[PDB]
Amino acid sequence: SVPSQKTYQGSYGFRLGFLHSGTAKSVTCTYSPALNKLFCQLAKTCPVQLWVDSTPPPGTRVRAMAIYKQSQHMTEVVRRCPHHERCSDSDGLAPPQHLIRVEGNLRAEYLDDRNTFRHSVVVPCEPPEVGSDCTTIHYNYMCYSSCMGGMNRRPILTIITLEDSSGNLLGRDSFEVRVCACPGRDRRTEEENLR
């Protein structure tokens, strides 16, 4: 089955935000609002902001999951390729098969769904650091979009869901991702292809 990707702010006015990182050749993570698409290098830090209009209950959590974007591929589980799942680049918490990791959060949990077999990573929802207006989660994507036997050039979406302590839906947002060697160049190209 295919998880919903419908944008849903819910009772708390949940939505994502992204930094404005530009498109220099040196950039390692950059987001295109026009394409709703994040471009990043392999295993590099990707800051994603969480914004709400009101404070959700303690015990609320934030889950990230990847799916294939194209209709003819959406039912296939997104996972790391046969090379990367065996490269022993473990952080001690993430299963080596999982494409999406959360960086630097000791309370991250990783799920292999027993019915759909899909992977996800979930962390507790927390208020912003003192002085800040939003909370930032740092994600890593652990295969290239081009990885043979893995994504194999197929575009993916990341779906971020806000959940209660039971796992019930409180909010949802999503963005496309391309993991590539030169995110700046690729963002510029795709934005021009759209123009």
Ligand SMILES: CCN(CC)C1CCN(Cc2cc(C#CCNc3ccccc3)cc(I)c2O)CC1
């Ligand atoms: C207009 C927005 N308005 C500005 C004044 C508010 C600014 C202040 N925010 C607070 C806020 C809270 C949470 C959370 C959580 C769950 N845990 C928890 C823990 C301890 C206690 C309670 C709850 C997430 C975010 I992201 C976040 O911005 C809510 C919105």
Ligand SMILES: [Zn+2]
């Ligand atoms: Zn790979």
